[PDB]
Amino acid sequence: DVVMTQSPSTLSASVGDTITITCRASQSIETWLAWYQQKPGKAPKLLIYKASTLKTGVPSRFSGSGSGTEFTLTISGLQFDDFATYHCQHYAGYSATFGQGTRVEIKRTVAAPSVFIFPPSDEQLKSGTASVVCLLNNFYPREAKVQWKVDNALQSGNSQESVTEQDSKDSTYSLSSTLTLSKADYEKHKVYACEVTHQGLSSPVTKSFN
Amino acid sequence: DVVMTQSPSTLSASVGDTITITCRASQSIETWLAWYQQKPGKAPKLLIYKASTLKTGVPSRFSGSGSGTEFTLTISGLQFDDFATYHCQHYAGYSATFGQGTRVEIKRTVAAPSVFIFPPSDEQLKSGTASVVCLLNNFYPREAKVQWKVDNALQSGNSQESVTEQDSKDSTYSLSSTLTLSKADYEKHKVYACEVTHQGLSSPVTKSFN
Amino acid sequence: EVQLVESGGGLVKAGGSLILSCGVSNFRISAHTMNWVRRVPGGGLEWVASISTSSTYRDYADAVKGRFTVSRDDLEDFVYLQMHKMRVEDTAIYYCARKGSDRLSDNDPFDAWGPGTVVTVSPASTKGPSVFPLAPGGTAALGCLVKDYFPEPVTVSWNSGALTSGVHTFPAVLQSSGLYSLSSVVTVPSSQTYICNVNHKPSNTKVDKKVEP
Amino acid sequence: EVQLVESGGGLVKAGGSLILSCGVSNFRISAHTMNWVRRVPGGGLEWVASISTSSTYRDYADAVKGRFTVSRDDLEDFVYLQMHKMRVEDTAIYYCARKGSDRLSDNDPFDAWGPGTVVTVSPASTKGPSVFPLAPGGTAALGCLVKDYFPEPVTVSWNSGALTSGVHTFPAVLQSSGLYSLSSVVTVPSSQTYICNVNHKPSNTKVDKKVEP
Ligand SMILES: OC[C@H]1O[C@H](O[C@@H]2[C@@H](O[C@@H]3[C@@H](O[C@@H]4[C@H](O)[C@@H](O)O[C@H](CO)[C@H]4O)O[C@H](CO)[C@@H](O)[C@@H]3O)O[C@H](CO)[C@@H](O)[C@@H]2O)[C@@H](O)[C@@H](O)[C@@H]1O
Numbered sequence: 038d039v040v041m042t043q044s045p046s047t048l049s050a051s052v053g054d055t056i057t058i059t060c061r062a063s064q065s066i067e068t069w070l071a072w073y074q075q076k077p078g079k080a081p082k083l084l085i086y087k088a089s090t091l092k093t094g095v096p097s098r099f100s101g102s103g104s105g106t107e108f109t110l111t112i113s114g115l116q117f118d119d120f121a122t123y124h125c126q127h128y129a130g131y132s133a134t135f136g137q138g139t140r141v142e143i144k145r146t147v148a149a150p151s152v153f154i155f156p157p158s159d160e161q162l163k164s165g166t167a168s169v170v171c172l173l174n175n176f177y178p179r180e181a182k183v184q185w186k187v188d189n190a191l192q193s194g195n196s197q198e199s200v201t202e203q204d205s206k207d208s209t210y211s212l213s214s215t216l217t218l219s220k221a222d223y224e225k226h227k228v229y230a231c232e233v234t235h236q237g238l239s240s241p242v243t244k245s246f247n
Numbered sequence: 248d249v250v251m252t253q254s255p256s257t258l259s260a261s262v263g264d265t266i267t268i269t270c271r272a273s274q275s276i277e278t279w280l281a282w283y284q285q286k287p288g289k290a291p292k293l294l295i296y297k298a299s300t301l302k303t304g305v306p307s308r309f310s311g312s313g314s315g316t317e318f319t320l321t322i323s324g325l326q327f328d329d330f331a332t333y334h335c336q337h338y339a340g341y342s343a344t345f346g347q348g349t350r351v352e353i354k355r356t357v358a359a360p361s362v363f364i365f366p367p368s369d370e371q372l373k374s375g376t377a378s379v380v381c382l383l384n385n386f387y388p389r390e391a392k393v394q395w396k397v398d399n400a401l402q403s404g405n406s407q408e409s410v411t412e413q414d415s416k417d418s419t420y421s422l423s424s425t426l427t428l429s430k431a432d433y434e435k436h437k438v439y440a441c442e443v444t445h446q447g448l449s450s451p452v453t454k455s456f457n
Numbered sequence: 458e459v460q461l462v463e464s465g466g467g468l469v470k471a472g473g474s475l476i477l478s479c480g481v482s483n484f485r486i487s488a489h490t491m492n493w494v495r496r497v498p499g500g501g502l503e504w505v506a507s508i509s510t511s512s513t514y515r516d517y518a519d520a521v522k523g524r525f526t527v528s529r530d531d532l533e534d535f536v537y538l539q540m541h542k543m544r545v546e547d548t549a550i551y552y553c554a555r556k557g558s559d560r561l562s563d564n565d566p567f568d569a570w571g572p573g574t575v576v577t578v579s580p581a582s583t584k585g586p587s588v589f590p591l592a593p594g595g596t597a598a599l600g601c602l603v604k605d606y607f608p609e610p611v612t613v614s615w616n617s618g619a620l621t622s623g624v625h626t627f628p629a630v631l632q633s634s635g636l637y638s639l640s641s642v643v644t645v646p647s648s649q650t651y652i653c654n655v656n657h658k659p660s661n662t663k664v665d666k667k668v669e670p
Numbered sequence: 671e672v673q674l675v676e677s678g679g680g681l682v683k684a685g686g687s688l689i690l691s692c693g694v695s696n697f698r699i700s701a702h703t704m705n706w707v708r709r710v711p712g713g714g715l716e717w718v719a720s721i722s723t724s725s726t727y728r729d730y731a732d733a734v735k736g737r738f739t740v741s742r743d744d745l746e747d748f749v750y751l752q753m754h755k756m757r758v759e760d761t762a763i764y765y766c767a768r769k770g771s772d773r774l775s776d777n778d779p780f781d782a783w784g785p786g787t788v789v790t791v792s793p794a795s796t797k798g799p800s801v802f803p804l805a806p807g808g809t810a811a812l813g814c815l816v817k818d819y820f821p822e823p824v825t826v827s828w829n830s831g832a833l834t835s836g837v838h839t840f841p842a843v844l845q846s847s848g849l850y851s852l853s854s855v856v857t858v859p860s861s862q863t864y865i866c867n868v869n870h871k872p873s874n875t876k877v878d879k880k881v882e883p
Pocket residue numbers: 130131487488489490491509510513556557558561562563564565
């Protein structure tokens with residue numbers, strides 16, 4: 038029952054920065070603490086174990102410190118391949134427990150999304166299914182909230198989101214959310230709205246159609 | 248590479264009959280030969296092993312004989328719970344090989360199917376899919392051939408059959424075959440026919456609609 | 458180069474079962490504790506289970522106790538994870554991970570990981586059927602097509618149990634979509650109104666459909 | 671009473687993988703050779719694999735060599751069967767079966783069987799996508815919705831590679847139906863005709879769709 042608490046959840050930084058990620062254990066774990074790197078869609082990679090022992094092959098700009106209940110991972114001079122999620126892990130002989138992960142992303146200025154809503158095509162509607170798409174284009178940071186409203190009632194369980202990686206050109210994110218319904222269900226209501234909340238919007242933005 | 252050959256494939260008999268099922272091996276297997284009973288949807292049950300040793304608990308109307316390349320399973324006085332599929336098996340220390348199975352069914356007179364074709368409902372068609380059903384009602388024996396013809400072209404891969412067990416009242420079989428298509432695909436052709444071959448039909452019977 | 462590769466992932470409905478396996482290249486598992494770890498959609502890692510050398514100790518996260526089992530096969534180098542009574546929160550990428558380091562000790566980090574296999578548990582463990590009619594001085598057939606339900610079984614009667622002679626309800630068929638279909642038919646005099654009562658206990662659904670020309 | 675229970679069956683597409691397991695009640699597997707047998711739709715039984723005590727010998731039917739693996743776990747009484755590169759003829763009911771008799775000998779029949787688990791392999795290992803348009807003095811968005819394909823990946827360009835600024839093609843999403851969906855969008859001046867070129871290599875499909883108001 039050791040609880041591991043990693044902070045912060047998200048860190049924005051630039052190539053060349055020195056950054057530190059903290060992990061705190063609810064009780065002393067001596068130095069039984071490992072740090073891992075993970076890229077989206079890839080396996081985790083071990084960087085540091087025994088709190089401060091660098092795995093052979095890992096570059097020296099990574100270091101770890103601490104003992105007891107407080108640990109730190111430092112990257113001294115971020116490079117472009119270091120933007121990733123970092124996880125701490127208390128390991129024991131026959132189990133392990135991980136902190137919640139820290140996503141390290143490229144810092145830029147705040148950018149509000151541009152929002153677009155698209156109705157299902159007539160071709161698709163004919164074959165028995167309606168897909169409604171909402172596009173959030175080029176925003177930063179990534180934290181965005183998209184709610185689907187059908188005749189003013191919040192939808193839940195019938196939509197899926199997909200977010201890009203940080204754009205090669207402008208370090209923003211884009212996001213699509215697709216609300217999927219049957220022909221029949223689609224036909225029962227009139228107003229289809231997508232409502233978006235983001236740090237760079239003064240108030241939530243709604244786009245809709247009839 | 249012993250090949251096991253069971254005959255016949257199908258045996259029709261009555262309560263009270265004495266029946267025999269034969270298994271032939273491509274080379275001597277001494278007496279390493281087992282017989283199993285199996286009901287539809289249930290696990291096989293061992294009846295006889297070492298060619299003629301009855302498993303404890305198995306009724307004495309079952310017996311087995313043979314040695315070498317020729318084996319026989321005899322049921323001396325069939326009862327109603329003996330209608331089932333019977334499988335022979337040559338077993339070795341680290342593998343086994345089964346004959347093709349004999350389905351034992353209740354003998355009756357030949358009965359030709361009555362054939363019905365049903366088009367998809369308008370309700371279903373609207374939601375993007377057409378199901379066409381063909382019914383073969385109360386026939387005997389079970390061996391029947393159902394071919395779907397769409398504008399005279401044989402369908403394959405887009406239909407599924409389902410056969411009942413021998414009817415409690417009249418010892419016949421019934422069979423449904425369902426050809427499943429999309430709205431679109433359905434709409435492309437005119438004449439939908441089901442053609443049925445059965446021992447009790449003088450020639451194949453076709454039912455169709457437009 | 459040392460490799461781990463998971464297999465067996467896919468889609469499951471809540472309540473269902475799924476088994477994963479992990480095979481390896483270029484090392485032997487026998488001196489290693491092996492583990493399963495999963496990455497949940499929020500991004501964080503959760504330790505799932507561990508199995509020590511010789512299978513002496515099998516440990517599982519509190520959330521999967523009594524539902525998951527881990528096994529190993531040291532002669533041909535496989536690890537297994539059985540998942541039963543699966544829940545929406547089991548949805549994740551599952552990795553097999555070796556515990557070890559350059560020189561083994563009684564407590565090492567996870568030094569080699571498989572690429573992961575995607576496991577998706579959808580929230581609907583049941584789905585009521587759709588019911589479509591099979592529309593009909595002699596002998597005539599009609600019936601109801603009971604399409605796209607899960608799991609089995611459905612029950613059909615006609616005229617709330619008043620019509621039983623000539624009723625044939627066929628064994629369900631498993632469609633390529635993972636949903637079941639069956640038809641129920643009855644032969645009736647060509648010369649009255651017919652209603653088939655579809656009962657689907659798993660989804661507490663009960664449908665009534667009138668079949669007519 | 672002695673019992674065997676298989677788990678892990680389901681639907682697979684040809685080429686895919688699936689793992690089965692077998693657990694037991696009221697006996698221990700360690701003194702028994704354990705087997706997998708399958709019943710094919712024609713009704714006959716086919717022996718699939720055997721694993722002797724201590725895993726000393728693993729034998730498989732000629733039709734599954736190099737594709738199936740059997741394992742056992744004697745400490746907690748499980749047997750496993752991994753099935754890879756599955757084929758339509760693997761479609762069957764799979765049983766786990768104990769080899770034994772009242773007094774063990776070097777060659778006994780199969781005296782106890784599980785109830786079986788259904789495994790269905792459908793013939794389509796690939797499926798091309800359907801492509802639907804996302805229809806649009808300022809800044810405007812449009813795109814193509816690429817729905818229901820398998821397996822990954824699809825490729826999208828616009829204007830046969832002539833339009834690349836502002837193109838966002840999102841990561842595919844796995845739908846509850848087992849088929850993938852993605853959208854590709856581009857922002858263009860509100861004031862010209864736009865065509866998205868969907869390439870699906872696994873199914874040798876290539877679609878062209880014009881997006882317009
Ligand atoms: O998960 C722990 C490690 O497991 C693998 O390494 C194996 C591990 O075996 C342990 C060993 O236990 C103790 C120590 O070896 C020592 O202090 O002496 C004690 C008395 O002999 C002994 O308990 O052996 C045990 C079985 O006898 C086994 O249960 C233990 O887990 O550690 C040794 C090295 O210490 C390795 O040789 C084993 O292969 C690896 O996965 C390792 O990375 C893990 O940390």
